[PDB]
Amino acid sequence: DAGIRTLVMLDEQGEQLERIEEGMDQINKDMKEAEKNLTDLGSGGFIRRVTNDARENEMDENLEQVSGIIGNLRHMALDMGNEIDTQNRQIDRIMEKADSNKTRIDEANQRATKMLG
Amino acid sequence: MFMDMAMLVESQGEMIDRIEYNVEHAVDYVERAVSDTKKAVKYQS
Amino acid sequence: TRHSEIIKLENSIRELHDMFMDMAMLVESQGEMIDRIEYNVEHAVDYVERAVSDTKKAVKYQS
Amino acid sequence: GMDTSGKQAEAMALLAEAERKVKNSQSFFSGLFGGSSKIEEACEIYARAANMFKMAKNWSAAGNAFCQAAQLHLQLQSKHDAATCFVDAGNAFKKADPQEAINCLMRAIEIYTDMGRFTIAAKHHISIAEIYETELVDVEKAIAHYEQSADYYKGEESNSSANKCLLKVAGYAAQLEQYQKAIDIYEQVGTSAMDSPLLKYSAKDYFFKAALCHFCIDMLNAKLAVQKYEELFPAFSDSRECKLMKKLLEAHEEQNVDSYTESVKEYDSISRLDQWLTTMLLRIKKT
Amino acid sequence: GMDTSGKQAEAMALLAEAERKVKNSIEEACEIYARAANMFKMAKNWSAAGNAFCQAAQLHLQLQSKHDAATCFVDAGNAFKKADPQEAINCLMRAIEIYTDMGRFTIAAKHHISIAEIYETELVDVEKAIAHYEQSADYYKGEESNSSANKCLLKVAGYAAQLEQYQKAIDIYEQVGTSAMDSPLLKYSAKDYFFKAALCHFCIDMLNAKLAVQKYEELFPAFSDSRECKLMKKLLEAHEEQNVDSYTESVKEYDSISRLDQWLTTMLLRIKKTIQ
Amino acid sequence: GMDTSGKQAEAMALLAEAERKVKNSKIEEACEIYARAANMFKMAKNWSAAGNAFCQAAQLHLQLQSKHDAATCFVDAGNAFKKADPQEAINCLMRAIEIYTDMGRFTIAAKHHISIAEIYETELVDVEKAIAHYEQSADYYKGEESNSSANKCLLKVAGYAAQLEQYQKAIDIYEQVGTSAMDSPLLKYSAKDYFFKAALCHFCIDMLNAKLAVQKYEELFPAFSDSRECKLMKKLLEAHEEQNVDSYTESVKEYDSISRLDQWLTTMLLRIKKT
Structure with a gap:
């Protein structure tokens, strides 16, 4: 259950990351256009049967069940894996943009104060 | 160990939501400023 | 048949363990990065708002 | 400690000074036409006083100051800052008195949706629904708010x-003894999530819920229902839910309440049951 | 190498230039101070970089600027972190004051957490760490995080149980466990917290622990099926007879099945010592 | 292929017309048109010529009044030369790193340091040189608290030093990192592994002190006892006390049956066992 909940939450986080990346791209485009305009303004068993007996059955059965579940987990794990990797790259890619944007505004404001006098 | 992973994932998610909210505010204000600058430039010119 | 099945189970367990190693480390790094970017964007928005407010007040003073 | 009394006294003095400033603002405007500098400064005092009251653990005073600032700045034709201050007041209200927060958030939602900002309106609607759920049991308003928020989110392609x-709407509707909507929502969500890579593993669960919500109507339409799922999603047969359903059906077909109860006990012992599932199983057992 | 002497000489020259610029009487002076401090940091001269940073912060605050002033104050605080722990606390307190005044309570909470961590790791003090952690927790709870x-x-309760009266630990553990019981994802861990609380009741008297465990079992049925409940019942039964042998046998068996945190070890040792 | 010839011709034409335009205020237009020509050359996939033109445009931008654009163009030129003469790319990336450090952005400087160390280690055989850049990047990151x-x-530098037969640096770094990981509430499960590695390195000095080292690790980290690495190490050391080759071979085979051993572990194991 914890595995499944983690998977779904990761999916939601990825969608949110894509949304914020789109927002950042829009911010950059709009700000650049605005600045330019303003400038233009100017398996058989698991235990030995030492004594047979009912106790030896369920134990074996239990082990068998365990094996099954573990198999599933493997796939789950690996699947979930891919997700985070992509996210990593995506996150980094926004930062640069934002940073660049920030820098621009500062210089823009500086210019807006240097042309006046 | 799985139990350990869960909380980290949750915290990262909530932080993502907060940053998203901030981005929406920023873009809205930028668009409004663009509209105001357009008005000023077109009418003054 | 014993050795095959038991070693197979152990191998599966080890595979899961190693995956979780790598990706717990990855998620920790990602958390640090997100922590940085949040403050970055907050400062950016605050400064742009402040500068544009200066612009409004100056232009209204001149006109 | 000293914090309580000191913060209360200083905040009260600052708020009284702000009151005097706003009282003198009208005279200043009439005599000289100073503009809005006085009003903006008074709004700044109000915001600072609201924040100080928030640090002072006096939620009501912070909410009142936020409301005063929001009203004054709305009078200044600035709807955005008014909406922001009203959101803060609503949180303080949800943190002081919730009834006021309801109308504050409604006003903020109206202001935001006037400009077409649907995401913020949906988030505020979700917050209002949560407020209704936590204290009151007025489910209907929560369902209405959740439906509105879901409609907005679907309209935003998110x-x-x-x-x-x-899913929340269907789960709450199934509580009111109205099963058709729950069945429809559960089946739609399950079929939608079947094809997703990550969500696929969860899909099975949804089906089970529908089946339980389909069992109350009549047993005959439950059996058939299971078939319809198994042919579409064969892997469903592997999950424990199918075996549990088949055993429960076999036990009920002959009024064997004891076998049904024993199977339920065993399944609960292996994994603890949820209150929703416990209640629904009890309801089914009544027959 | 050339780095040490060259960067030190250049930093001194830039500091002298900024001092002369202010002597003429201004933003250029702040920029020169910032560049000199950056080069000092690059030179590994950790000390005296925070001094220049604080000078720049004061000069910038002189002209009503508050954001960059707070950022540079935090920069100086973290720079002094390793060289001089004491001054970092004061710089971070100043930054916290400014940020809380302006209302960015999340930043204040993060700085409080950092202050508590530095206090508990390098210096030796528990009360101040507890106070800072409680303040940060209050801020975050006000912000509904x-x-x-x-x-x-949880950290505050752990330290209070480590040294302070166990009442705080009982309260915090009970509240956290009760809150976590209803949560879907977190419910599975709830048992743990409850167990801890019960142990803290043992340190006072056996009857209080018995009543508390009965109440917890009534509240949380699954606690009855937990191995912790069986271990507690067995330990209390052994203690009621003043038989250290059964106590030791049960503790050793439970340790054999699962390793100990070294917290439970301390509580068990304390309880065993007082068996008499 | 037609595509390569067509794109090469288009890029050459754009660069030539850019040169003519600049030869004819003018600095900004020249820089922009040269940047466009460099982009078209990059899409033409002529890596060497595209990188040369791009670095020339970077220098021309340096002639223009701006720093951020200069650093961006320098890093792009370094990436373009990544598949060309390594020395020029290294020089350009070093200049970009110097500018970034001058701007106080130590994190990007550390990233570029790691990148240049990677290209140096993978392309050329000189390993010691990459050690300096890796250590500098580690220093920067530690100063930035990352x-x-x-x-x-x-870890990378410690592994390389262990390969270089300087066991002291490797053991120091491994012990420090392992104890730091054990202290941290997270990553604790990995700590065991580090300890094991240290033991192997310490074996290359002598065998008797290895017993003391493993006992020290045991008393410092009790859980290390239950790890199969501790059992394997103690069994190998006990077997080596008698000069029999079968025992340690059988032990390593039994361990290998579960998980395949890596190249680094295998080479050090061969080194220890052969002598």
Whole structure:
């Protein structure tokens, strides 16, 4: 259950990351256009049967069940894996943009104060 | 160990939501400023 | 048949363990990065708002 | 400690000074036409006083100051800052008195949706629904708010979030003894999530719920229902839910309440049952 | 190498230039101070970089600027972190004051967490760490960040049980466990917290622990099926007979099945010592 | 292929017309048109010529009044030369790193340091040189409090030093990183592994002190006892006390049956066992 909940939450986080990346791209485009305009303004068993007996059955059965579940987990794990990797790259890619944007505004404001006098 | 992973994932998610909210505010204000600058430039010119 | 099945189970367990190693480390790094970017964007928005407010007040003073 | 009394006294003095400033603002405007500098400064005092009251653990005073600032700045034709201050007041109200927060958030939602900002309106609607759920048991208003938020999210093409709202709506509707909507929502969500890579593993669960919500109507339409799922999603047969359903059907077909109860006990012992599932199983057992 | 002497000489030259510029009487002076401090940091001269940073922060604050002033104050504080722990606390307190005044309570909570961490790791003090953690938890709870508040409260309760009266530990553990019981994802861990609380009741008297465990079993049925409940019942039964042998046998068996945190070890040792 | 010839012709034409335009205020237009020509050359996939033109445009931008654009163009030129003469790319990336450090952005400087170390280690055989850049990047990251990157760089340099037969640096770094990981509430499960590695290195000095080292690790970290690495190490040391080749071979085979051993572990194991 914890595995499944983690998977779904990761999916939601990825969608949110894509949304914020789109927002950042829009911010950059709009700000650049605005600045330019303003400038233009100017398996058989698991235990030995030492004594047979009912106790030896369920134990074996239990082990068998365990094996099954573990198999599933493997796939789950690996699947979930891919997700985070992509996210990593995506996150980094926004930062640069934002940073660049920030820098621009500062210089823009500086210019807006240097042309006046 | 799985139990350990869960909380980290949750915290990262909530932080993502907060940053998203901030981005929406920023873009809205930028668009409004663009509209105001357009008005000023077109009418003054 | 014993050795095959038991070693197979152990191998599966080890595979899961190693995956979780790598990706717990990855998620920790990602958390640090997100922590940085949040403050970055907050400062950016605050400064742009402040500068544009200066612009409004100056232009209204001149006109 | 000293914090309580000191913060209360200083905040009260600052708020009284702000009151005097706003009283003198009208005279200043009449005599000289100073503009809005006095009003903006008074709004700054109000915001600072609200924040100080918030640090002073006096939520009501912070909410009142936020409301005063929001009203004054709305009078200044600035709807955005008014909405922001009203959101802060609503949180303080949800943190002081919730009834006021309801109308504050409604006003903020109206102001935001006037400009077409649907995402913020949906988030505020979700917050209002949560407020209703936590204290009161007035389910109907929560369902209405959740439906509105889900509609907005679907209209924004933001999938995987409207799904959760619809799941909440269906789960709460199934409580009121109205099963058709729950069945429809559960089957739709399950078939939608079947094809997703990550969500696929969860899909099975949804089906089970529908089956339980389909069992109350009549047993005959439950059996058939299971078939319809198994042919579409063969892997469903592997999950424990199918075996549990078949055993429960076999036990009920002959009025064997004891076998049904024993199977339920065993399944609960292996994994603890949820209150929703416990209640629904009890309801089914009544027959 | 050339780095040490060259960067030190250039930093001194830039400091002298900024001092002369202010002597003429201004933003250029602040920029020169910032560049000199950056080069000092690059030179590994950790000390005296925070001094230049604080000078720049004061000069910038002189002209009503507050954001960059707070950022540079935090920069100086973290720079002094390793060279001089004491001054970092004061710089971070100043930054916290400014940020809380302006209302960015999340930043104040993060700085409080950092202050508590530095206090507990390098210097030796528990009361100040407890106070800072409680303040940060209060801020986060006011900001409805439940997970961080839970973490801070858990740490505070752990330290209070380590030294302070166990009442605080009982309260915090009970509240956290009750809150976590209803949560879907977190419910599975709830048992743990409850167990801890019960142990803290043992340190006072056996009857209080018995009543508390009965109440917890009534509240949380699954606690009855937990191995912790069986271990507690067996330990209390052994203690009621003043038989250290059964106590030791049960403790050793439970340790054999699962390793100990070294917290439970301390509580068990304390309880065993007082068996008499 | 038609595409390569067509794109090469288009890029050459654009660069030639850009040169003519600049030869004819003018600095900004020249820089922009040269940047466009460099982009078209990059899409033409002539890596060497495209990188040369791009670095020329970077220098021309340096002639223009701007720093951020200069650093961006320098890093792009370094990436373009990544598949060309390594020396020019290294020089350009070093200049970009110097500019970034001058701007106080130590994190990007550390990233570029790691990148240049990677290209140096993978392309050429000189390993010691990459050690300096890795250590500098680790120092920068540690100064910036990014513990994860510092740990990664320290692990890489420690492994390379262990390969270089300087066991002292490797053991120091491994012990420090392992104890730091054990202290941290997270990553604790990995700590065991580090300890094991240290033991192997310490064996290359002598065998008798290895017993003391493993006992010290045991008393410092009790859980290490239950790890199969501890059992394997103690069994190998006990077997080596008698000069029999079968025992340690059988032990390593039994361990290998579960998980395949890596190249680094295998080479050090062969080195220890053969003598």
